[PDB]
Amino acid sequence: GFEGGQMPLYRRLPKFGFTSRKAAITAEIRLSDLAKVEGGVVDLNTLKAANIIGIQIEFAKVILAGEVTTPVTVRGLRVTKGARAAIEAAGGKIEE
Amino acid sequence: GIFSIFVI
Amino acid sequence: PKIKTVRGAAKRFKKTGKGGFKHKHANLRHILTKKATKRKRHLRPKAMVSKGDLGLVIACLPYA
Amino acid sequence: GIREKIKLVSSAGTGHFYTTTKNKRTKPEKLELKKFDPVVRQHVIYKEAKI
Amino acid sequence: TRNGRDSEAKRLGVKRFGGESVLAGSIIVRQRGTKFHAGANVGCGRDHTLFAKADGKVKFEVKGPKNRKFISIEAE
RNA sequence: CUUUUGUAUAAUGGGUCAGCGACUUAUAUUCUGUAGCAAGGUUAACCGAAUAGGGGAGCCGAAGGGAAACCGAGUCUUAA
RNA sequence: GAGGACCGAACCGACUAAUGUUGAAAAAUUAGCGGAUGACUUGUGGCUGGGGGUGAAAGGCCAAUCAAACCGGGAGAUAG
RNA sequence: UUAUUAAAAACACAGCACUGUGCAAACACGAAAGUGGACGUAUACGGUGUGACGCCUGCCCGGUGCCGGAAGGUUAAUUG
RNA sequence: UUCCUUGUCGGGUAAGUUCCGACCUGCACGAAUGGCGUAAUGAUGGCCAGGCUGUCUCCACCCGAGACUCAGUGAAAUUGAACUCGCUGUGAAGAUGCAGUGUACCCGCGGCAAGACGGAAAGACCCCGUGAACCUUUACUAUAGCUUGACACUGAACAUU
RNA sequence: UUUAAUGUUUGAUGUUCUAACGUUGACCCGUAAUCCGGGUUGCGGACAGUGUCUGGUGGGUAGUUUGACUGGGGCGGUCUCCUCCUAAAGAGUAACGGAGGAGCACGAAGGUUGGCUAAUCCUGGUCGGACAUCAGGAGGUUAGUGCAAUGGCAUAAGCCAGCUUGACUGCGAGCGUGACGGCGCGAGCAGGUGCGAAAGCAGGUCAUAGUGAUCCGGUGGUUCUGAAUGGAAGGGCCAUCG
Numbered sequence: 001g002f003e004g005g006q007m008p009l010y011r012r013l014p015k016f017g018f019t020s021r022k023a024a025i026t027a028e029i030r031l032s033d034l035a036k037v038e039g040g041v042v043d044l045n046t047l048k049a050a051n052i053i054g055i056q057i058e059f060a061k062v063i064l065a066g067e068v069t070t071p072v073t074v075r076g077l078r079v080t081k082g083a084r085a086a087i088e089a090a091g092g093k094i095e096e
Numbered sequence: 097g098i099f100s101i102f103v104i
Numbered sequence: 105p106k107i108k109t110v111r112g113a114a115k116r117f118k119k120t121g122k123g124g125f126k127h128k129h130a131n132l133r134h135i136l137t138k139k140a141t142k143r144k145r146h147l148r149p150k151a152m153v154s155k156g157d158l159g160l161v162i163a164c165l166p167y168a
Numbered sequence: 169g170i171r172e173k174i175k176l177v178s179s180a181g182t183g184h185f186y187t188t189t190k191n192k193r194t195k196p197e198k199l200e201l202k203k204f205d206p207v208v209r210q211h212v213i214y215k216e217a218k219i
Numbered sequence: 220t221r222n223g224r225d226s227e228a229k230r231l232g233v234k235r236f237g238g239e240s241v242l243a244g245s246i247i248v249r250q251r252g253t254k255f256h257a258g259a260n261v262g263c264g265r266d267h268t269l270f271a272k273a274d275g276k277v278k279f280e281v282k283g284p285k286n287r288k289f290i291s292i293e294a295e
Numbered sequence: 296c297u298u299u300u301g302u303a304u305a306a307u308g309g310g311u312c313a314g315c316g317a318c319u320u321a322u323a324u325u326c327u328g329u330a331g332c333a334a335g336g337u338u339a340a341c342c343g344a345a346u347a348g349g350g351g352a353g354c355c356g357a358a359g360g361g362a363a364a365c366c367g368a369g370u371c372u373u374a375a
Numbered sequence: 376g377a378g379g380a381c382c383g384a385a386c387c388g389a390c391u392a393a394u395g396u397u398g399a400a401a402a403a404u405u406a407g408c409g410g411a412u413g414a415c416u417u418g419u420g421g422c423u424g425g426g427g428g429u430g431a432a433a434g435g436c437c438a439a440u441c442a443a444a445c446c447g448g449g450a451g452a453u454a455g
Numbered sequence: 456u457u458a459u460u461a462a463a464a465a466c467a468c469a470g471c472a473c474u475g476u477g478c479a480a481a482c483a484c485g486a487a488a489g490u491g492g493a494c495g496u497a498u499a500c501g502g503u504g505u506g507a508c509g510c511c512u513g514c515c516c517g518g519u520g521c522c523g524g525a526a527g528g529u530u531a532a533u534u535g
Numbered sequence: 536u537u538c539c540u541u542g543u544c545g546g547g548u549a550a551g552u553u554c555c556g557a558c559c560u561g562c563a564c565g566a567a568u569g570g571c572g573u574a575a576u577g578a579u580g581g582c583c584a585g586g587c588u589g590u591c592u593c594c595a596c597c598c599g600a601g602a603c604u605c606a607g608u609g610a611a612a613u614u615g616a617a618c619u620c621g622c623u624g625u626g627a628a629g630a631u632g633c634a635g636u637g638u639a640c641c642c643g644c645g646g647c648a649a650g651a652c653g654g655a656a657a658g659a660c661c662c663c664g665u666g667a668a669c670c671u672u673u674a675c676u677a678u679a680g681c682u683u684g685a686c687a688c689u690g691a692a693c694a695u696u
Numbered sequence: 697u698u699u700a701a702u703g704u705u706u707g708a709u710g711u712u713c714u715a716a717c718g719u720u721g722a723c724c725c726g727u728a729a730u731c732c733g734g735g736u737u738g739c740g741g742a743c744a745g746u747g748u749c750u751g752g753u754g755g756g757u758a759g760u761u762u763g764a765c766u767g768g769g770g771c772g773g774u775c776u777c778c779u780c781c782u783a784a785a786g787a788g789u790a791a792c793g794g795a796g797g798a799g800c801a802c803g804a805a806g807g808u809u810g811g812c813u814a815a816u817c818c819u820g821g822u823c824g825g826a827c828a829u830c831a832g833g834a835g836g837u838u839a840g841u842g843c844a845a846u847g848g849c850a851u852a853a854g855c856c857a858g859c860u861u862g863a864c865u866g867c868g869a870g871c872g873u874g875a876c877g878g879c880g881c882g883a884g885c886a887g888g889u890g891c892g893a894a895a896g897c898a899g900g901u902c903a904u905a906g907u908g909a910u911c912c913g914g915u916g917g918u919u920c921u922g923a924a925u926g927g928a929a930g931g932g933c934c935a936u937c938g
């Protein structure tokens with residue numbers, strides 16, 4: 001970063017923001033991960049037992065990425081608007 | 097050598 | 105040993121979706137009264153780092 | 169130099185204010201203008217206070 | 220001993236010459252006063268910069284009873 | 296030979312011969328080449344009649360946007 | 376028969392000139408020179424130690440080393 | 456007196472002065488215990504400056520230092 | 536101690552920027568970081584004279600120790616390689632080596648130092664280094680020591696406010 | 697508001713006292729001993745002295761700083777921004793080259809509607825003169841522009857008056873100029889306004905100087921976060937100050 005004694009670029013420019021502690025304990029699930037559990041029910045503890053999310057994760061979201069073919073029940077997770085349609089289009093059901 | 101003896 | 109992050113650069117740059125970096129504009133901390141409103145309005149959103157300075161940021165952020 | 173910064177406080181409930189400068193000595197009366205308040209989106213009388 | 224001062228160059232002058240196709244909003248000339256004047260589809264900024272307000276070709280002409288130089292834009 | 300705009304230079308260095316004498320090593324990181332596997336790839340410590348086999352704890356990757364809560368093929372800005 | 380008296384050997388010093396200057400010698404020889412009963416000179420032992428000593432004071436001297444001794448470590452200091 | 460390019464007009468000096476110090480002295484070396492001063496006691500001891508002897512040593516207390524004074528202004532820890 | 540300055544005048548000399556005496560225009564003396572005198576002293580600074588002389592005019596001769604030759608023993612600094620002349624020009628601007636030109640048979644010995652920008656010591660002067668050391672101060676920050684009060688070791692009684 | 701009063705908290709200074717503490721006063725013992733310790737006595741005495749905290753003084757000692765450009769360095773100048781020339785008719789272009797300015801001002805000196813036109817000179821006229829106010833004529837910008845110089849300005853950007861706060865909030869196609877950080881021009885949209893009958897014009901001022909990154913903080917606001925949980929502190933974001 002040394003620029004000859006001129007004030008360098010990472011120090012003429014201002015700092016911004018703060019780090020959220022809640023962002024580190026939250027994950028996102030894709031539609032390709034819903035067929036990698038065993039039981040056909042998808043909650044937080046089945047996603048942890050299949051090594052999909054980490055052990056410190058306390059919140060998760062299913063997003064529209066990839067595809068799901070099987071009937072799947074989702075328990076206690078958040079679902080996006082398009083992924084609720086895609087889980088219900090494959091015969092699944094979403095409850096909180 | 098004591099060089100400072102040289103007259104400058 | 106591991107490379108250490110320049111921790112003051114990690115407080116000023118964030119990596120975007122294709123590998124560029126964003127930063128907050130300068131000149132918006134104090135004497136704001138004498139400045140025009142159009143000038144202060146354009147300094148509010150975040151910008152991208154130019155091409156010539158990207159390698160200097162990459163040197164500061166080996167783990168970004 | 170001589171010209172002192174003030175600010176114009178909105179007479180609506182909002183905390184919004186404009187800032188400007190004013191010669192304290194030739195014009196000792198309080199400045200007062202109708203300016204756009206962006207929180208309630210109307211033109212309200214604004215009044216001078218200290219910076 | 221008494222001198223030694225000068226200002227920075229302002230890069231004034233003509234940016235788009237005659238017949239060049241420009242986009243709307245393009246700066247045609249930077250000037251101090253109105254050395255050139257605004258014609259059809261040509262605006263004048265607050266520092267007398269002449270810019271394009273439509274797409275087309277730059278046209279220079281001398282008009283009026285004072286023989287002043289005008290800058291216009293002819294749509295292509 | 297070196298150093299310089301420029302050296303036969305009267306600028307530097309070497310009397311000669313033989314032997315020794317200066318871009319390495321560790322760990323991280325990125326780019327390139329090549330090989331394996333491929334929406335997946337790979338294990339560390341450790342266990343192990345031990346370069347085998349086990350061990351997936353973890354790491355990187357398939358999704359981003361925002362300061363963030365949060366939303367999510369979008370998101371942020373804004374009353375829009 | 377006094378004297379920091381006088382002349383002058385031993386004894387202690389070092390003013391002048393020549394010489395030597397890969398010396399006979401890392402400070403000397405030759406010829407002249409000052410003091411020579413005193414604040415003299417010398418043998419033997421002892422004490423004062425490095426930002427410290429000691430100094431009738433020249434930053435002098437502390438083992439041919441001094442505007443901060445020598446030896447060993449930090450140490451392969453650092454050298455645009 | 457600058458061992459080893461300076462021996463002098465430089466240093467010291469007897470004499471003069473100012474200043475401190477009442478003795479568990481002032482002061483100095485010592486985390487301290489102690490020691491020197493001194494087995495001394497103001498006719499003494501430390502510091503400073505001048506420098507035998509003769510004639511002398513004029514004016515200035517505004518600045519800095521030092522000695523004295525305490526009305527008043529300001530002012531820490533502490534209390535809250 | 537005086538820059539201008541060898542100030543001006545007198546003395547000493549045939550001739551004196553030094554010396555001695557005096558003047559006063561003290562660039563910029565002066566009273567104990569002393570002023571001004573002063574006998575005696577000084578391997579102290581300056582100036583004049585008599586004696587004396589190779590200091591000199593202007594050198595000559597002699598006596599010894601080297602230098603020289605014979606025998607024995609036997610260094611050193613330096614050194615890119617050398618078949619290592621002059622002059623005028625050229626040229627990283629002062630040429631043994633380049634150009635033109637002139638002179639020059641090969642090799643020693645005793646002498647002298649004009650050149651080899653001769654030898655010797657990575658210039659002490661000067662500049663530079665975001666180099667060092669030590670010294671100064673009313674530079675910055677600290678601090679030993681000295682000094683101020685509070686609490687502690689630390690208590691009893693009695694007055695005044 | 698003052699006084700004096702009884703019960704009552706200290707705070708101080710003063711005077712006595714001895715029992716802490718000092719004793720480098722005397723005497724005895726250990727003891728063959730000017731150390732030291734114990735004992736007995738005198739003098740002092742809650743002082744002095746030491747510890748923690750704190751104000752002053754503190755080259756006695758220590759660690760450090762003490763800019764660069766420069767026809768060598770020093771001494772002297774200068775160091776950012778604006779205008780003209782050098783600058784060779786696009787932009788840019790050096791010198792310790794030739795010449796001058798800035799570190800503001802203004803709620804009107806800003807917006808709009810309506811209107812208007814200068815210097816200098818001559819001629820006649822009360823004080824009035826070389827120069828005031830007035831009338832006429834010449835003239836044509838030789839004036840004016842808030843402050844330098846240049847380029848502009850009559851459809852006036854110059855002068856005068858009525859009304860006003862657009863010297864607005866969120867944005868912005870597209871361009872100019874910089875190694876960058878940054879700086880500049882801008883039609884057009886959304887909301888809400890001023891002037892005008894209306895077309896329209898208005899996001900400061902004829903343009904170009906009138907300025908300082910970051911950090912650390914201060915002050916208001918906010919539908920963000922809040923280390924067991926509910927808050928709060930602190931942080932973020934927006935506006936703004938040093």
Ligand SMILES: CC[C@H]1OC(=O)[C@H](C)[C@@H](O[C@@H]2C[C@@](C)(OC)[C@@H](O)[C@H](C)O2)[C@H](C)[C@@H](O[C@@H]2O[C@H](C)C[C@H](N(C)C)[C@H]2O)[C@@](C)(O)C[C@@H](C)C(=O)[C@H](C)[C@@H](O)[C@@]1(C)O
Pocket residue numbers: 097098099100101102103396655656
């Ligand atoms: C006895 C024996 C010694 O020689 C001397 O003392 C002679 C008498 C010096 O006198 C001289 C005498 C005096 C006048 O110089 C003649 C004076 O100028 C110098 C400082 O000392 C010389 C010669 C000096 O020369 C001159 O040094 C000058 C700095 C530069 C000059 N030249 C490069 C330009 C150079 O020749 C310089 C320092 O001593 C020589 C250095 C290298 C030494 O150390 C010398 C060789 C010693 O070792 C030597 C053995 O001891």
Ligand SMILES: [Mg+2]
Pocket residue numbers: 132133
């Ligand atoms: Mg802010």
Ligand SMILES: [Mg+2]
Pocket residue numbers: 296297307308
């Ligand atoms: Mg070389």
Ligand SMILES: [Mg+2]
Pocket residue numbers: none
């Ligand atoms: Mg090299």
Ligand SMILES: [Mg+2]
Pocket residue numbers: none
């Ligand atoms: Mg050179």
Ligand SMILES: [Mg+2]
Pocket residue numbers: none
């Ligand atoms: Mg080169």
Ligand SMILES: [Mg+2]
Pocket residue numbers: none
């Ligand atoms: Mg050169």
Ligand SMILES: [Mg+2]
Pocket residue numbers: none
């Ligand atoms: Mg050549």
Ligand SMILES: [Mg+2]
Pocket residue numbers: none
């Ligand atoms: Mg050579």
Ligand SMILES: [Mg+2]
Pocket residue numbers: 306
């Ligand atoms: Mg040389």
Ligand SMILES: [Mg+2]
Pocket residue numbers: 308309
């Ligand atoms: Mg050599």
Ligand SMILES: [Mg+2]
Pocket residue numbers: 311
């Ligand atoms: Mg060799």
Ligand SMILES: [Mg+2]
Pocket residue numbers: none
């Ligand atoms: Mg294995």
Ligand SMILES: [Mg+2]
Pocket residue numbers: none
């Ligand atoms: Mg979008």
Ligand SMILES: [Mg+2]
Pocket residue numbers: 380
């Ligand atoms: Mg005698």
Ligand SMILES: [Mg+2]
Pocket residue numbers: 382383411
């Ligand atoms: Mg004698």
